[PDB]
Design a protein around this ligand. Structure first.
Ligand SMILES: *[C@@H]1O[C@H](CO)[C@@H](O[C@@H]2O[C@H](CO)[C@@H](O)[C@H](O)[C@H]2NC(C)=O)[C@H](O)[C@H]1NC(C)=O
Ligand SMILES: *[C@@H]1O[C@H](CO)[C@@H](O[C@@H]2O[C@H](CO)[C@@H](O)[C@H](O)[C@H]2NC(C)=O)[C@H](O)[C@H]1NC(C)=O
Ligand code: NAG
Ligand code: NAG
Ligand code: NAG
Ligand code: NAG
Ligand code: BMA
Ligand code: BMA
Lengths: 222, 202, 119, 112, 222, 202, 112, 119
């Protein structure tokens, strides 16, 4: 359920709470920047429907929308560069057969990026796939596909290979994101045995700024 | 309260054990200490909670070495897998009787699991190309020390090689470059004092 | 006392896949690898493969790759080899041996009685 | 790959005479870990082989002090200060630093 | 663009701003109850992104979400019976060839109803249409269809007749809403000449609690 | 500031003129007065704005009778149409130089436009039925005074008749009822001292 | 509907003799507005008809004082106190309170 | 002086739709209705219809409904009738007259010269 949200300066941002808990009483929100410890920003009381901010924060900046029953959304105003990070929706758990109070259930986390977002062009990932080398299958008796993606601004990208149908999840090693100018680039590969080249493989890449608002799908030759 | 984690990056072989420190200063009488794991997909997963008034609790492969007067708790992970490469956060928690109580986390350490100490293996080198882009693939070499060199004449842009662990237990490397003469490139691997060329297998 | 024993002998027809076992006892079965090595009659030893039981991590010789499959039953503390496409030349004495962690000294601590597989 | 070579590959040695068996490798056996691996294994005919020397220099427990090992780089040598009736059999120098795990040709010990 | 929003007590409600104005500077919000004068509740400054409440209102009750550029939404917490009414999104206009400052542009208005909404059953309108009387067309040479709807709780209902295609809008007299027990009922009729009975007519009823979240459509016999 | 509108319901014939009052008390020196129309579909539409320092402005069919010392402005609508039946709100506005300034509205009057004074017409009566529901339809009678009576035996529920203006300029009435004997109902209209039955046209 | 009926429907009246023409209606002409409508119209042969009496009692301007109107309920009557040579022609009592706007049968004025 | 005049006469063949006009001048054309009335030769008047020019609101006699259509041109201050399905019996003298607001006294103030429509 991971996701990213990119917004310009002075705009407003929405961050969804992935918790499906029921009859909760408080909903805490945590910010995790880069290189810094996670820290709580606020906590929303649903018994009285009021959000309490940690000391040192300017009122009128956050909000905990509750569009439905047991569904929460954090709303940020006056976005500036510092607002970027990861946002977690968390809550304690009440009761147990053995009263441990063991954990604090944490959400899936949503990345937020704040940019200028006025000179930004279309930054959807553009795939430039690779074909297996015949010399490689000549002796090693295997094929190594390579799904290359380039020129995407939000680095939060999920690439996984599903062969032809979703039930066939194949382990695929993947390199780290590489920064090219203002955008980012990535590449993944998959090694398949002799009894795999008879099918078609897809590197189903999920990205926020992807075209059509849905995850892409790149068919490979057999 | 203030929690600091000394380590910034830890690397351990598979099936070994690792220990991550957590120093902290508090003021309350009774408190709690939790350990959380953040995957590369940004998912905070609960690991263990140690009762301050209780003994050294053990949960699965995770153990905590806690002493009441120590003011420092360390997490010991035994029989490391390959999916344990993550970011470990140490959190101090106020008495959980109330619901407003928050967890104060540290900067968090990072854990990486390299393949076990292995005999050397000669890697296999191949070249892929679609357009001006060129990919050099190196397979199944245990010693991380490697230097992939792409020999050509019109290198426009170059990318640092990506070296990853394989399901077989060894290393796979891939290097990507931009070349006008796509078919005129060659690959050289200076691994373990030995030289491997891409054409040695054709 | 650490002790690994194997079936004394075996006689199969050519073209039939065979299964070999190496029962181990008297030590921590997990902490040590298991090396299978063949020996042709009148010739020196030839390494077949290695299996790590904790992670079930197996490596095979290039020539014997595919022909031999190594597996482990940790519950019963056993190590098995599957031999495929048996022919005339695939008759030899097969041995299982115990190794160490490769970081504080590697060796072949103990050996079994072996099994003289004949086709 | 890595292939070992035993020089004498036979030794008809009488009792009481020290002997030396040398074996060489195509590539250096100095592992990047910081050790070199070469196991001197003794196969008594009719039974399973037993390990004599591990880590080139060290000697397995339960083995008489006559046996010793030396060498470095790509060349190693096992030495028998005193040759007795129980040393007859076969000897292998085994290299484990490279995964193919090549065995030696085999040195047969005999008597005059 | 008129609409109605029904919500239970203690829930939260969203009211959309129908203004399509551009480069606005302030957005005022007006409440109009029944039998009482319209009164302004708050005004949102978009230059600084801050909503100012009229004196006498408890902070933490309203909010002016801005999900996109030039799109505003009012969010209400802790809904109680008094919160019902009509909400207007309004704004002054700046500049003119002759500096009149003539008007204050007003929105389409959205009705808000606050109920218990726990014992509420399915209250979508249920049509029970009527057929023309043969005696009526015998001498008067005309037909009078009658589209009857009954048992709907939100009284904000829009019934208009479109014949077969939307371009054919027919004037149709309509009676006032009648309250039956806890629900409401309505009926409309249309008189058609001799050169109209050869087609089919639809009383396209728009209602918030209508099934499938879209306006209904009732085909009539020729 | 406080604005009150005296009238609660006003009814006028078509093509005539009507006048709606608006009393108000203020404190500023220069102000403004606006008039707004709310349709049955809840859509506030601007009508006229009268400058306090200006003369009696006229916009289309709407005029304002304003005097500076009067402290009371009336809106005159001339040549009333049939779509002017609405709710009229009188709003007082602070000096519009600023953008925070609000309009304070009154309770608002209601305007209805009846058909012009017309000669009497005998209405035509018909009956429709689909299921237990019964509809009595009365067409084209000018005098509003009417008494639709449904004669039957098992009246379960009854609804007050709905009387509306027609595009022809006369009145159409429809009365809805619930009857077990759908085909055994009769309709009687006591209009203009004369009796009309539903079967007089069959 | 509403239909008027003129009783004499002919009148051969000499000069100087007052005369009365009565007309009756099937239904009352008292409008719900608060007035009754009955127009006594004079049609001189060869030209357009001219209105003599409106609203039963009142008289159109430009008409001699001899003409007068009376009646109520469903029966009305026009009276001519003095009959002259310019009164000859046709007379209609016209009812406008009901929309069909029925006209009278017509009374012809003649002389002896 | 208020004055309404009409075409003197008209002769058309049967089965042809005809158009009649009533030009009005010297008064507020909007504030007064316009009544068209027919007169058969040798019989009394028969009301045809009424047209209100301000709202263009028209009412017709039941018998003449559909046959006669009343329209108004307010720009030129004219009132027209369209006669359809002309037959032998549809020949008579047609007259246009001016009425009042029906609330402060109704009357036929003035009459035109009429038009003797013959088929
Ligand atoms: C090299 O990359 C190009 C660009 O993606 C590949 O062309 C695609 O081929 C697939 C085959 O199924 C088509 O569906 C796509 O529409 C093509 N994309 C284009 C033309 O932009 C090409 O196949 C790659 N070469 C290989 C894999 O050998
Ligand atoms: C009386 O009302 C019923 C109930 O709506 C009408 O039945 C509908 O008939 C239409 C004809 O096109 C069907 O499409 C609907 O599905 C029917 N609705 C039902 C069965 O619930 C019936 O037509 C009405 N009688 C008339 C108009 O004479
Ligand atoms: C960025 O793009 C510019 C375009 O002029 C190019 O010169 C430069 O080399 C690029 N840099 C990188 C790091 O890709
Ligand atoms: C190491 O590389 C050097 C390069 O000069 C060569 O001389 C030497 O033989 C190499 N050693 C091995 C073991 O390959
Ligand atoms: C409301 O429903 C009840 C159900 O028992 C019924 O008795 C009653 O008459 C209904 N009232 C109205 C006004 O419809
Ligand atoms: C009015 O109704 C009464 C009922 O008795 C009747 O006598 C009278 O004639 C009626 N009048 C008209 C004008 O219909
Ligand atoms: O996509 C363009 C074409 O190339 C190949 C496939 O991807 C098909 O979808 C299509 O025939
Ligand atoms: O709706 C049920 C049926 O009745 C009639 C039409 O409304 C069709 O849509 C269908 O054949």
């Amino acid at each position: 359920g991971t996701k990213s949200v990119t917004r310009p300066t002075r705009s407003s941002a929405e961050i969804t709470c992935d918790l499906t808990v029921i009859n909760a009483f408080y909903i805490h929100w945590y910010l995790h920047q880069e290189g810094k410890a996670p820290q709580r920003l606020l906590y929303y009381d649903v018994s009285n429907s009021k959000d309490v901010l940690e000391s040192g924060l300017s009122p009128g900046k956050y909000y905990t929308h509750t569009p439905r029953r047991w569904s929460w959304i954090l709303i940020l105003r006056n976005l500036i560069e510092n607002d970027s990070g990861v946002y977690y929706c968390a809550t304690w758990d009440r009761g147990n057969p053995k009263t441990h109070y063991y954990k604090k259930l944490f959400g899936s986390g949503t990345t937020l990026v704040v940019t200028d977002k006025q000179l930004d062009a279309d930054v959807s990932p553009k795939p430039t796939i690779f074909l297996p080398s015949i010399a490689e299958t000549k002796l090693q008796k295997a094929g190594t596909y390579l799904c290359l993606l380039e020129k995407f601004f939000p680095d939060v990208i999920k690439i996984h290979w599903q062969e032809k149908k979703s039930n066939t999840i194949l382990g695929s090693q993947e390199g780290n994101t590489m920064k090219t100018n203002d955008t980012y680039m990535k590449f993944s590969w998959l090694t398949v045995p002799e009894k795999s080249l008879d099918k078609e493989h897809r590197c189903i890449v999920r990205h926020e700024n992807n075209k059509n608002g849905v995850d892409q799908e790149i068919i490979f030759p057999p | 309260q203030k929690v600091t984690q000394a380590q910034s990056s830890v690397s351990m072989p598979v099936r070994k054990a690792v220990t991550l420190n957590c120093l902290y200063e508090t003021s309350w009488w009774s408190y709690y200490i939790f350990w959380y794991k953040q995957l590369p997909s940004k998912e905070m997963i609960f690991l263990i909670r140690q009762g301050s008034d209780e003994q050294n609790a053990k949960s699965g492969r995770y153990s905590v070495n806690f002493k009441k007067a120590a003011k420092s708790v360390a997490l010991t992970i035994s029989a490391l897998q390959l999916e344990d490469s993550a970011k470990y956060f140490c959190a101090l928690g106020d008495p959980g009787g109330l619901n407003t109580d928050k967890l104060i986390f540290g900067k968090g350490t990072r854990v990486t699991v390299e393949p076990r100490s292995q005999p050397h293996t000669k890697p296999s080198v191949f070249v892929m190309k679609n357009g001006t882009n060129v990919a050099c693939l190196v397979k199944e070499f245990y010693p991380k020390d490697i230097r992939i060199n792409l020999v050509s004449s019109k290198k426009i842009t170059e990318f640092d090689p990506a070296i990853v662990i394989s399901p077989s237990g060894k290393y796979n490397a891939v290097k990507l470059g931009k070349y006008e003469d796509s078919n005129s490139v060659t690959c050289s691997v200076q691994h373990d004092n030995k030289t491997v060329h891409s054409t040695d297998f054709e | 006392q650490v002790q690994l024993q194997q079936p004394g002998a075996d006689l199969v027809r050519p073209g039939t896949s065979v299964k070999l076992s190496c029962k181990a006892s008297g030590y921590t079965f997990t902490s040590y690898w298991m090396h299978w090595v063949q020996q042709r009659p009148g010739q020196g030893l030839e390494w077949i493969g290695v299996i790590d039981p904790s992670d079930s991590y197996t490596n095979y010789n290039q020539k014997f790759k595919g022909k031999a499959t190594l597996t482990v039953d940790t519950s019963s503390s056993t190590a098995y080899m599957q031999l495929s496409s048996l022919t005339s030349e695939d008759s030899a004495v097969y041995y299982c041996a115990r190794s160490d962690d490769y970081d504080e000294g590697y060796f072949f601590d103990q050996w079994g009685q072996g099994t003289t597989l004949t086709v | 790959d890595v292939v070992m070579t035993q020089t004498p590959l036979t030794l008809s040695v009488t009792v009481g005479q020290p002997a030396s068996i040398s074996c060489k490798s195509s590539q250096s056996l100095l592992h990047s870990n910081g050790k070199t691996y070469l196991n001197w294994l003794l196969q008594r005919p009719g039974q399973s082989p037993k390990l004599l020397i591990y880590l080139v220099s060290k000697v397995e427990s339960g083995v008489p002090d006559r046996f010793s090992g030396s060498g470095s780089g790509t060349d190693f040598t096992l030495k028998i200060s005193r040759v007795e009736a129980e040393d007859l059999g076969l000897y292998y120098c085994l290299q484990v630093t490279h995964f193919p795990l090549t065995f030696g040709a085999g040195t047969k010990l005999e008597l005059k």
